[PDB]
Amino acid sequence: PLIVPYNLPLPGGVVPRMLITILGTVKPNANRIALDFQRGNDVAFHFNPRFNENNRRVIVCNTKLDNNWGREERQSVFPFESGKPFKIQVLVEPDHFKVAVNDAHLLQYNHRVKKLNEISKLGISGDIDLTSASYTMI
């Protein structure tokens, strides 16, 4: 186990068939979780479960370019629960990131940042206890 925030290096960036597995437990009374796939200062893929946006649970996904957030993609399907162990898997595919939580498909996010081999860090932050962050090739 690791104390967030934590940065997982992704040397030489990501590539299709790379499967990133984040294991942890959501804190009690959690407000937010964030994964940030970074290309330098740019965020290629921000994955942001929000436990209380306007008293609703929602997943917000976005990209940050030149320090500006772009168009949000939102999902109401919300597989996280305060206090519970989770597994987030991000599968890098040729045209999107595919996310599954607890072995159930959640969403796809099309690549806005095209230079996958420069997406060289994954930030993990928010209201979690982080057990593990690793990857393999499928």
Ligand SMILES: CO[C@@H]1[C@@H](n2cc(-c3ccc(Cl)c(F)c3F)nn2)[C@@H](O)[C@@H](CO)O[C@@H]1Cc1cn([C@H]2COC[C@H]2F)nn1
């Ligand atoms: C409040 O900031 C968030 C921003 N955010 C979260 C964290 C964050 C830090 C720490 C932790 Cl521990 C953690 F979980 C975290 F989510 N940092 N930045 C990120 O979620 C963003 C996603 O779109 O929305 C907000 C910023 C934003 C949204 N928009 C819209 C208007 O124009 C287009 C749209 F994009 N403009 N700016």
